[PDB]
Design a protein around this ligand. Structure first.
Ligand SMILES: O=C(O)Cc1c(C(=O)O)[nH]c2c(Cl)cc(Cl)cc12
Ligand SMILES: O=C(O)Cc1c(C(=O)O)[nH]c2c(Cl)cc(Cl)cc12
Ligand SMILES: [Zn+2]
Ligand SMILES: [Zn+2]
Ligand SMILES: [Zn+2]
Ligand SMILES: [Zn+2]
Lengths: 360, 360
């Protein structure tokens, strides 16, 4: 059976299980079950399923080199799909909540969930809560007797916590750290002293890389009972390297990909985000360019946004991206080589993950 | 050592552990650690600690009748305090998110967390996420080697899910179920056919009783390794009975307790909530009283709110509350008697929980 089709069939199974349990154990009525079914479909489906499919791909890699009964191969693939959906539902939770936190308008070419007429923020915050609760219901039901259940739940909660910490790093990245104070309304920075490569790397590591690359790779190893087969420090290093590149691509797309292709009107400039473009620009700008950036960044005014986009184009940030990309290709290839010492199979899944990221 | 003082000392220990881990493993800077320390204090402290202290009280009950080394008694009490704080932090998560969902103004005589000038909804949604993530960090750290870890995490995630389902039942209680639809803005009911005792009991059971009574009682049994000592079906029945009474008290207080004592301006009438007062009023009103209720309920207009409060006073709902209370006293005493068959100690903790609820 083809990987994507198995993955999508498992979504139907998981959905039916969750909705049937709400009826038999939670006293749900048919109308609220329908609302939750539509919420699950709208928030969980329509993406590329890159995170979920990475778990499946890692597990398939090991099945090709490990001896198992057919029933065991089916069980491992079904566990990889359920684990992959845990990650997709975790992402769905953070997209719902982040779109509300940021006042976003569109997501995946459609309105953000909270903007649906019959949803509203009052419901959407709780719907996002339910999405993450469903990841735990899935784990306890499908993996009840599995030897990896403890390790999987412990890893999943560390990654979820790291992600929430990353969201805090992201939403506060335009403020001066010494001025953070719940009692005082937060002004935007004027000096941009905290727009540095090291601070940018911390935001990205926590807000994206743990759940987008580390969790799918390690979940694939856990469902395969193959973690003792790899060097965990190399898995962490390669995940944080590919994840950073993935976020740099997203930051560039936010500013330069047309809204039809991107599926939204990007507002990182208006939001004064500590993006790869702003940090890189400040890393090469002269005094006049820095001054013009400070006078225009973080403002809703489209003329001020146009000035910032022009500064980025005039600063030839394409050259910096090509240099960054060449360095990442180099380091990712080095880590893949080190991963071959203990597992050529796992190093190959990492090469596939990299190729899919680099070529998207 | 006195129960409350041990419980509060453990808060300091848990706080220091969480903040120190953010520094050593999550690359946090001192300013963001301070923001999170103030967020934890503001959202977790200041209440009565009824839920957390129930875990401690149940564990103390068993220590009085069970043989243990002194070091074991200290370990069980410390585990009961950590488990009690898991529940208090879970409540802190739901209060932060519910205040944002409901547009609430005050909580515990102070502004709701999202209303603090340096917080905002953008941060507060994520702060509420972190509060629940901290419950899992606490469990995995303090209970890593405990025999009850699996049962405790499985119970905690079922209770959290039941609570989020309850929040959905609550926020949609003023809509007609057949009209629920993410695509269509939801009108308030005109017939109030879903304001019935059975529907009210479902909202309350899920939104309050699992986390306020069931979870503290069962967590006290788990940390004491005493679950096989009680009949779980009686624990569930007594928890859902006391929890319902607790919510009925809160619904009456929302409408009639002055804002200074309540710590907020109650708005259940304006919000068209399916409260004990509305269901009970509709259960005894004549046609004219029903018609006047329909013309005034669920409106911000203070004159319309005053009409509803007058209808409640004229309908002599105090008599219905006294009859409900007499019936609860009767059923709670019956369940306490049944609990004595297997454990006089546990039945006594249930009597204390009831006395604290009934006399508050
Ligand atoms: O390659 C693109 O996505 C398009 C693109 C444009 C542009 O469209 O003018 N400008 C860019 C700059 Cl300044 C930096 C980087 Cl890294 C990419 C681009
Ligand atoms: O006992 C109170 O909390 C006060 C109170 C008042 C009132 O203050 O007029 N009115 C009530 C009604 Cl209609 C029903 C119930 Cl059960 C209680 C009250
Ligand atoms: Zn965001
Ligand atoms: Zn972006
Ligand atoms: Zn609410
Ligand atoms: Zn209330």
């Amino acid at each position: 059976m083809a990987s994507m089709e198995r993955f999508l069939s498992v979504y139907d199974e998981v959905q039916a299980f969750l909705l049937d349990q709400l009826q038999s154990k939670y006293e749900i009525d048919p109308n609220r079950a329908r609302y939750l079914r539509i919420m699950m479909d709208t928030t969980c489906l329509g993406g590329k399923y890159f995170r979920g499919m990475t778990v499946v791909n890692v597990a398939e890699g090991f099945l090709a080199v490990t001896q198992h009964d057919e029933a065991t191969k089916e069980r491992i693939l079904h566990d990889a799909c359920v684990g992959g959906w845990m990650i997709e539902f975790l992402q769905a939770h953070y997209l719902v909540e982040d779109d509300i936190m940021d006042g976003s308008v569109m997501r995946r070419g459609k309105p953000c969930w909270y903007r649906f007429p019959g949803v509203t923020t009052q419901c959407a915050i709780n719907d996002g809560i339910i999405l993450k609760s469903w990841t735990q219901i899935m784990a306890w039901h499908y993996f009840a007797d599995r030897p990896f259940l403890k390790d999987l739940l412990c890893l999943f909660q560390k990654v979820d916590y790291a992600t929430a910490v990353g969201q805090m790093y992201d939403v506060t990245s335009m403020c001066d750290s010494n001025k953070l104070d719940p009692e005082v309304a937060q002004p935007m920075t004027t000096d941009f002293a905290e727009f540095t490569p090291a601070i940018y790397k911390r935001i990205v590591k926590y807000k994206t890389t743990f759940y987008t690359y580390l969790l799918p790779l390690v979940m694939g190893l856990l469902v395969s009972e193959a973690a003792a087969s790899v060097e965990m420090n190399l898995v962490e290093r390669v995940a944080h390297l590919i994840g950073e590149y993935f976020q740099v691509q997203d930051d560039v797309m936010d500013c330069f990909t047309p809204p039809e292709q991107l599926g939204k009107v990007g507002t990182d400039i208006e939001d004064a985000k500590c993006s790869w473009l702003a940090v890189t620009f400040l890393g090469k700008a002269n005094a006049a360019q820095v001054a013009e950036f400070k006078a225009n960044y973080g403002e809703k005014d489209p003329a001020k946004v146009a000035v910032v986009k022009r500064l980025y184009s005039k600063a030839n940030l394409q050259a910096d991206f090509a240099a960054y990309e060449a360095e990442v290709v180099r380091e990712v290839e080095s880590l893949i080589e080190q991963l071959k010492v203990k597992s050529p199979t796992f190093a190959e899944s990492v090469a596939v993950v990299w190729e899919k990221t680099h070529k998207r």
